[PDB]
mmCIF file of N, CA, C and O in Angstrom:
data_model
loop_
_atom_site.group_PDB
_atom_site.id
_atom_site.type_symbol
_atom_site.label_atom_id
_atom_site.label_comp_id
_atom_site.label_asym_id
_atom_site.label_seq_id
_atom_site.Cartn_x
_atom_site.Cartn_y
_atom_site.Cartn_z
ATOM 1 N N UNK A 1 17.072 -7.422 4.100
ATOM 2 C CA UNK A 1 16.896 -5.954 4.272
ATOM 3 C C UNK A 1 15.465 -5.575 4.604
ATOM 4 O O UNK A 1 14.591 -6.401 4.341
ATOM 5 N N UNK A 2 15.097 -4.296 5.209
ATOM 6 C CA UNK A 2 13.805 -3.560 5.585
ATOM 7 C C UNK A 2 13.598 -2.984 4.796
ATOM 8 O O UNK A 2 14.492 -2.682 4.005
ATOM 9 N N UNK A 3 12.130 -2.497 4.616
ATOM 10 C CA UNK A 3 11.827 -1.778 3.259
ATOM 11 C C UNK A 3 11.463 -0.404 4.237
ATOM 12 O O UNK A 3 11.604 -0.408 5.460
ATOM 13 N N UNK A 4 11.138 0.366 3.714
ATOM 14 C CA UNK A 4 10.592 2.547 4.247
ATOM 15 C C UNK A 4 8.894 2.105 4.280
ATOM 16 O O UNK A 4 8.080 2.001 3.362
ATOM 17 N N UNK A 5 8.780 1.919 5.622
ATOM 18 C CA UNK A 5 7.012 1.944 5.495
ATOM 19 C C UNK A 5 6.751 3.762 5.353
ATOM 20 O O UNK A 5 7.609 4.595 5.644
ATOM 21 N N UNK A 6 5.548 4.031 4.907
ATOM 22 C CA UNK A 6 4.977 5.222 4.714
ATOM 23 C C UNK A 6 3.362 5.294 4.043
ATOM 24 O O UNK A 6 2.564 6.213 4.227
ATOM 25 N N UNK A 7 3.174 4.246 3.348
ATOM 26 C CA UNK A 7 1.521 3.689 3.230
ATOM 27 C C UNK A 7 1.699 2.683 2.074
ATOM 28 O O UNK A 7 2.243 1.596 2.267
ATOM 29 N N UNK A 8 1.288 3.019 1.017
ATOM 30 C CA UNK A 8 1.392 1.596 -0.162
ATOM 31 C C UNK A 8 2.248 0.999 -0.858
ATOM 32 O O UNK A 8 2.637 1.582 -1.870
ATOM 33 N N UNK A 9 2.793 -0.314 -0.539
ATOM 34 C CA UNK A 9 3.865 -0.933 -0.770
ATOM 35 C C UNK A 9 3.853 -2.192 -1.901
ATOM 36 O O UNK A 9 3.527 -3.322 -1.537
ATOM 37 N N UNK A 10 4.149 -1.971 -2.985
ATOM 38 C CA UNK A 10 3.954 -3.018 -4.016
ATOM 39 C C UNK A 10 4.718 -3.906 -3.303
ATOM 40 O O UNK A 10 5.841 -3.550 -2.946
ATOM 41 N N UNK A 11 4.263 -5.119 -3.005
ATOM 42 C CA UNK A 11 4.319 -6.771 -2.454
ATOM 43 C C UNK A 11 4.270 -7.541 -3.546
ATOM 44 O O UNK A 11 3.289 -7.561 -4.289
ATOM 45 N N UNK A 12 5.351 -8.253 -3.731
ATOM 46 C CA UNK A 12 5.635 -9.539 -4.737
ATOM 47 C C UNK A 12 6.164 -10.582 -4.104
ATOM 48 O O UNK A 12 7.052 -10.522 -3.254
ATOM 49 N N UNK A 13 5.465 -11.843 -4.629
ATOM 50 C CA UNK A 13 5.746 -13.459 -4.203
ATOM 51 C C UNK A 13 5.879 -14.059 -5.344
ATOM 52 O O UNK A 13 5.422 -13.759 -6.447
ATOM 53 N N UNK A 14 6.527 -14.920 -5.018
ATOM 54 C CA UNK A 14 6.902 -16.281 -6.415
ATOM 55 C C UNK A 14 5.549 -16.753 -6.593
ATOM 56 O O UNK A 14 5.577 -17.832 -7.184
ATOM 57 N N UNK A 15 4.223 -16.328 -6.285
ATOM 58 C CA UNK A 15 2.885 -17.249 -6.216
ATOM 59 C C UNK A 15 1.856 -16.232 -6.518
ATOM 60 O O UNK A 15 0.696 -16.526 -6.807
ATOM 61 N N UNK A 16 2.479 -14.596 -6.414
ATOM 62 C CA UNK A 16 1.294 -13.594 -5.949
ATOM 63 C C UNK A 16 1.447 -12.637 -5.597
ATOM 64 O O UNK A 16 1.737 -12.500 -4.409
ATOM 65 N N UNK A 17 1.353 -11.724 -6.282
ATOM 66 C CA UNK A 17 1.477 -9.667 -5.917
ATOM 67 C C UNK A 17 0.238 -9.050 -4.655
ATOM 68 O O UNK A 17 -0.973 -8.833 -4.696
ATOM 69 N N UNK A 18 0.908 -8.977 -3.990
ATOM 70 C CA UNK A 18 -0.109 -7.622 -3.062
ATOM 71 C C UNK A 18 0.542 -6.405 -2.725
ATOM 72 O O UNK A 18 1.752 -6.228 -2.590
ATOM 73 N N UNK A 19 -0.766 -5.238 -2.554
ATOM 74 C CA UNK A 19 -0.416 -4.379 -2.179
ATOM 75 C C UNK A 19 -0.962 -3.879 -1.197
ATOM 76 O O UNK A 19 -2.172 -3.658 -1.164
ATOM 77 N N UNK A 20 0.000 -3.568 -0.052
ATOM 78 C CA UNK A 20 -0.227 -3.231 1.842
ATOM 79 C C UNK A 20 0.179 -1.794 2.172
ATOM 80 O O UNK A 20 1.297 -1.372 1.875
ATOM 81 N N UNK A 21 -0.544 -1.208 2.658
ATOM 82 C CA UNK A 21 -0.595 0.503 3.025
ATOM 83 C C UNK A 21 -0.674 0.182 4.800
ATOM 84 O O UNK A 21 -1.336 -0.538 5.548
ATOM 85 N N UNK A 22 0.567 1.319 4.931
ATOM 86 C CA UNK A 22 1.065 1.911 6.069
ATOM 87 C C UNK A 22 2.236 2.927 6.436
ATOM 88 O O UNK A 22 3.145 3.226 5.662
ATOM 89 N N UNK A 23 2.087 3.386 7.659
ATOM 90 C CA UNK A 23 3.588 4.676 7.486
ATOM 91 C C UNK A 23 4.381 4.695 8.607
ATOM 92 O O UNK A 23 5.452 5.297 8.684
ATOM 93 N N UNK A 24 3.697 3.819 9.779
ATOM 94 C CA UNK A 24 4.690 3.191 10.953
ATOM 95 C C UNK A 24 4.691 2.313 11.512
ATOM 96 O O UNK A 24 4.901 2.141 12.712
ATOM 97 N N UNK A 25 4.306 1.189 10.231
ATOM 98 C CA UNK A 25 4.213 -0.302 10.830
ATOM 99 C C UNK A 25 5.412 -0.599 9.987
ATOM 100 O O UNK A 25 6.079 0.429 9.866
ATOM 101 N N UNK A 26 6.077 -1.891 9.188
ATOM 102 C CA UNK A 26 6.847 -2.487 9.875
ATOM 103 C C UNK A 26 7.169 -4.161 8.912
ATOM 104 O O UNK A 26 7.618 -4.346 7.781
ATOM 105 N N UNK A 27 6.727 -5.073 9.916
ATOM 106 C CA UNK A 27 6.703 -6.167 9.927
ATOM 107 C C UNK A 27 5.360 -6.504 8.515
ATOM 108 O O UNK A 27 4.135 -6.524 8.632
ATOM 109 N N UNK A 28 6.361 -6.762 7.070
ATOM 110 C CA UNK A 28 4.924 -7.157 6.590
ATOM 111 C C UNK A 28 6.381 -8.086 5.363
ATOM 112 O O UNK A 28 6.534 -9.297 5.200
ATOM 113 N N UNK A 29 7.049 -7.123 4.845
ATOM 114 C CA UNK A 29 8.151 -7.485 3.687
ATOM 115 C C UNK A 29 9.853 -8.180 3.866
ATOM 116 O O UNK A 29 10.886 -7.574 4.148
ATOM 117 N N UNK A 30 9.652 -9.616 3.589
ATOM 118 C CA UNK A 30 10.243 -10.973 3.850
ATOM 119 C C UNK A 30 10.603 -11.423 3.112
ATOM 120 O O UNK A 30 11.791 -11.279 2.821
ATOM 121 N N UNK A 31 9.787 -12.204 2.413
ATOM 122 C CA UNK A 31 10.303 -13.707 1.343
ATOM 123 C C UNK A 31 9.453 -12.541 -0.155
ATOM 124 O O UNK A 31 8.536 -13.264 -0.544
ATOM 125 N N UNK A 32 9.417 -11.495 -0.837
ATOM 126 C CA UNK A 32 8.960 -10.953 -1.641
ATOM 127 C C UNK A 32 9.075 -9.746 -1.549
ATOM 128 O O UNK A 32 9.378 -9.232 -0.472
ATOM 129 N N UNK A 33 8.810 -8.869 -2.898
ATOM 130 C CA UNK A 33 8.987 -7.259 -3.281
ATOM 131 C C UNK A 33 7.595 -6.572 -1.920
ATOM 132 O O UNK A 33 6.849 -7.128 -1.114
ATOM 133 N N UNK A 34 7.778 -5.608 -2.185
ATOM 134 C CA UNK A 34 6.567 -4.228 -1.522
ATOM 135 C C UNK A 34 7.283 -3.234 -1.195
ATOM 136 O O UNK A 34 7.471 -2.795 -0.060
ATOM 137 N N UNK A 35 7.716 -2.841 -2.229
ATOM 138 C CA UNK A 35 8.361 -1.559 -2.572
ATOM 139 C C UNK A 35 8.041 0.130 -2.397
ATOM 140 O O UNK A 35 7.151 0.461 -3.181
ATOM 141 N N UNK A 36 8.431 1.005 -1.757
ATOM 142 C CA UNK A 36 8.019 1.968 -1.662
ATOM 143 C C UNK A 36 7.236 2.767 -2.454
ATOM 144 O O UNK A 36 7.799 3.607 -3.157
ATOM 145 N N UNK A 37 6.198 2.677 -2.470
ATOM 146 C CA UNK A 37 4.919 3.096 -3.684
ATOM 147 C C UNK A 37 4.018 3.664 -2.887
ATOM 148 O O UNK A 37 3.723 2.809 -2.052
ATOM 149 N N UNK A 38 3.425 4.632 -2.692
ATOM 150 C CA UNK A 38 2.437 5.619 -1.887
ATOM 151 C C UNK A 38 0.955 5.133 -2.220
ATOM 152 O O UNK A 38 -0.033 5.026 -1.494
ATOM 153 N N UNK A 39 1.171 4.851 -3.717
ATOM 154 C CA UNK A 39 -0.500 4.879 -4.352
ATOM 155 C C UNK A 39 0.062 3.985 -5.423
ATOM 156 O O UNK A 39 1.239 3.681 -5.617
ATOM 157 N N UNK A 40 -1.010 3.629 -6.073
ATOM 158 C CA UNK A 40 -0.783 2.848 -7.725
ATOM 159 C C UNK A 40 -2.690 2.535 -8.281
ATOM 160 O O UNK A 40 -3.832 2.724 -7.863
ATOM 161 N N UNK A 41 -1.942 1.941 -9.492
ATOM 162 C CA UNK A 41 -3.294 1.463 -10.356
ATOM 163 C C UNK A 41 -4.004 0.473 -9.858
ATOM 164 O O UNK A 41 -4.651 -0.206 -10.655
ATOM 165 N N UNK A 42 -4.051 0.174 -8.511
ATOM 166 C CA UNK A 42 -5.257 -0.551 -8.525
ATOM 167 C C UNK A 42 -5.139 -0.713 -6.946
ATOM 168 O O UNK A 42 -5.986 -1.437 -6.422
ATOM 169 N N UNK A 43 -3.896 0.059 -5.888
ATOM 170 C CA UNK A 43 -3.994 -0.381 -4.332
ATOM 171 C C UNK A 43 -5.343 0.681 -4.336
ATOM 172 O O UNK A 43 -5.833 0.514 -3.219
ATOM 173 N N UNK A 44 -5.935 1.406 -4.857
ATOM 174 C CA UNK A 44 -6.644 2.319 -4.564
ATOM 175 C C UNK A 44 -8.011 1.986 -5.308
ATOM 176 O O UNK A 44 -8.953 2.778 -5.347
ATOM 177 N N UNK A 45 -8.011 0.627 -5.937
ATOM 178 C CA UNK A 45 -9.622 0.181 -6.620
ATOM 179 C C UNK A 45 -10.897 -0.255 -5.545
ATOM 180 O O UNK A 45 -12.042 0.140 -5.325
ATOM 181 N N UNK A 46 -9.743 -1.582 -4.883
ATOM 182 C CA UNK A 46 -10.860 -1.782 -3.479
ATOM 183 C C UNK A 46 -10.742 -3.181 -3.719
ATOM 184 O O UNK A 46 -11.320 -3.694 -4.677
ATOM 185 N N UNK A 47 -9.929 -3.948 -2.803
ATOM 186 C CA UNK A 47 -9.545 -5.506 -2.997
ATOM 187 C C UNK A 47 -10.049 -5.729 -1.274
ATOM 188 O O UNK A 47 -10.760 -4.992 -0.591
ATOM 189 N N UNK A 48 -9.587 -6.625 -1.024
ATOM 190 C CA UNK A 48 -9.359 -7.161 0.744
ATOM 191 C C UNK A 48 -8.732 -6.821 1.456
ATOM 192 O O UNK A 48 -8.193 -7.433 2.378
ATOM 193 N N UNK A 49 -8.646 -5.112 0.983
ATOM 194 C CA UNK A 49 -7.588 -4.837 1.681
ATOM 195 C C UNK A 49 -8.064 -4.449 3.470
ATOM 196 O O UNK A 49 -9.089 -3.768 3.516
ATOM 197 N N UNK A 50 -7.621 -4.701 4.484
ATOM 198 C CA UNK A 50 -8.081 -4.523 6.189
ATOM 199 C C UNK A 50 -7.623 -3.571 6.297
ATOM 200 O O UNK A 50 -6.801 -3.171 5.472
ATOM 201 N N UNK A 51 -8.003 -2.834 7.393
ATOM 202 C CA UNK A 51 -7.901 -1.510 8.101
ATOM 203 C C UNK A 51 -7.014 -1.316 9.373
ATOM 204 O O UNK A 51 -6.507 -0.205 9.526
ATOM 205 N N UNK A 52 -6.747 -2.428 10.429
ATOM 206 C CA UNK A 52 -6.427 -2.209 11.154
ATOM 207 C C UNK A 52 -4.938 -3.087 10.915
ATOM 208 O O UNK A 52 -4.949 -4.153 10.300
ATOM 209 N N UNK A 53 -3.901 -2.607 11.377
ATOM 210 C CA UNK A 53 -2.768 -3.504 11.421
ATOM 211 C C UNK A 53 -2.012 -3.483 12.713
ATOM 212 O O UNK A 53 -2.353 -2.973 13.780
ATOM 213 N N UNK A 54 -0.880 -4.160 12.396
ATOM 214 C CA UNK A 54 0.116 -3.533 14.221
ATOM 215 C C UNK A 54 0.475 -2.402 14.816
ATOM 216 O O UNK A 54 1.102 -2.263 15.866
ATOM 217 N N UNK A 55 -0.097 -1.334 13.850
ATOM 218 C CA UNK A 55 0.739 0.203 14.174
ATOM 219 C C UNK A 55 -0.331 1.276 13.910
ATOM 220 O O UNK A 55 -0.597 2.111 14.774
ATOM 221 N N UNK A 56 -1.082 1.246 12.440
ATOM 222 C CA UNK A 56 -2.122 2.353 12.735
ATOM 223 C C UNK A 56 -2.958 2.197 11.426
ATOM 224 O O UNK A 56 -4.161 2.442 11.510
ATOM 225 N N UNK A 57 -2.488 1.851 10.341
ATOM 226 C CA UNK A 57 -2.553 1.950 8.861
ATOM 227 C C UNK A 57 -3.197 0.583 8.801
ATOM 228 O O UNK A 57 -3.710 -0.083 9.700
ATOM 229 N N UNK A 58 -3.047 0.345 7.564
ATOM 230 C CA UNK A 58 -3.708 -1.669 7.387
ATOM 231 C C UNK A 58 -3.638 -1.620 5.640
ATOM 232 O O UNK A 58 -3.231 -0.605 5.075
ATOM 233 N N UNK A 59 -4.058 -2.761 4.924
ATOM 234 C CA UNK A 59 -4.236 -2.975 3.909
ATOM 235 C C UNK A 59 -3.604 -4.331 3.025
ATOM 236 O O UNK A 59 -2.374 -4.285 3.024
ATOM 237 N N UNK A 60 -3.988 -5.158 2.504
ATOM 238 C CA UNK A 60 -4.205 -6.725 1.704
ATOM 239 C C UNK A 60 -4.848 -6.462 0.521
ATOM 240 O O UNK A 60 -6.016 -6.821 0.370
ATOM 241 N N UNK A 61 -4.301 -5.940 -0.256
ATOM 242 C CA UNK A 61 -5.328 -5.948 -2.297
ATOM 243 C C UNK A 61 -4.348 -7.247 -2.612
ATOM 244 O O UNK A 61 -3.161 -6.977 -2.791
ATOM 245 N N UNK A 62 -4.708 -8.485 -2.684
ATOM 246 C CA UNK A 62 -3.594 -9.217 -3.709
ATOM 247 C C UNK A 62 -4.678 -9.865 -4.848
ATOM 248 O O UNK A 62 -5.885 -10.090 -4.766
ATOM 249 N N UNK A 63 -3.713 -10.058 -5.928
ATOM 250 C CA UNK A 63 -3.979 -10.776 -6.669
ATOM 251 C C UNK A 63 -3.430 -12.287 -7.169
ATOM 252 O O UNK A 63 -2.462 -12.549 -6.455
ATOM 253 N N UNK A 64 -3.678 -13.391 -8.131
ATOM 254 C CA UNK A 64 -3.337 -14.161 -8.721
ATOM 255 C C UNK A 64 -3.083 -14.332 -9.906
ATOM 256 O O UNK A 64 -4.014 -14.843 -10.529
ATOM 257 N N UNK A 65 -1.952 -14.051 -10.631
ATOM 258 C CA UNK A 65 -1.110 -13.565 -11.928
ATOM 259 C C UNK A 65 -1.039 -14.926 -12.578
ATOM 260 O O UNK A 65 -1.789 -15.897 -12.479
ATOM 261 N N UNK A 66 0.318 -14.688 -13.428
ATOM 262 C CA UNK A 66 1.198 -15.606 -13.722
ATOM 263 C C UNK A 66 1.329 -16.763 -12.855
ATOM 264 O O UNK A 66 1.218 -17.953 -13.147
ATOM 265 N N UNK A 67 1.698 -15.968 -11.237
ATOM 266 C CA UNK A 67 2.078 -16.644 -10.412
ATOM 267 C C UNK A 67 3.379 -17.712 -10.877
ATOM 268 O O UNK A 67 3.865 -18.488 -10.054
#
């Protein structure tokens, strides 16, 4: 299934959570969660997240958990 781009998307992996902001891109959610989330506790602290992506928006905050 496709997820609703619109900007910040909680992203989950069997290895690693990120969170990716956009609202008409697309191509990012596959093999893990990134769930329709606008904002949260920490896509908005200041990780790695990039600016430019395939469509207009951008953004990469991940971390290393549990994993």
């Amino acid at each position: 299934g496709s997820h609703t781009p619109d900007e910040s998307f909680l992203c989950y992996q069997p290895d690693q959570v990120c969170c990716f902001i956009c609202r008409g891109a697309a191509p990012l959610p596959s093999e893990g969660e990134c769930n329709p989330h606008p904002t949260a506790p920490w896509c908005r602290e200041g990780a790695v997240e990039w600016v430019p992506y395939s469509t207009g928006q951008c953004r990469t905050t991940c971390i290393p958990y549990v994993e």
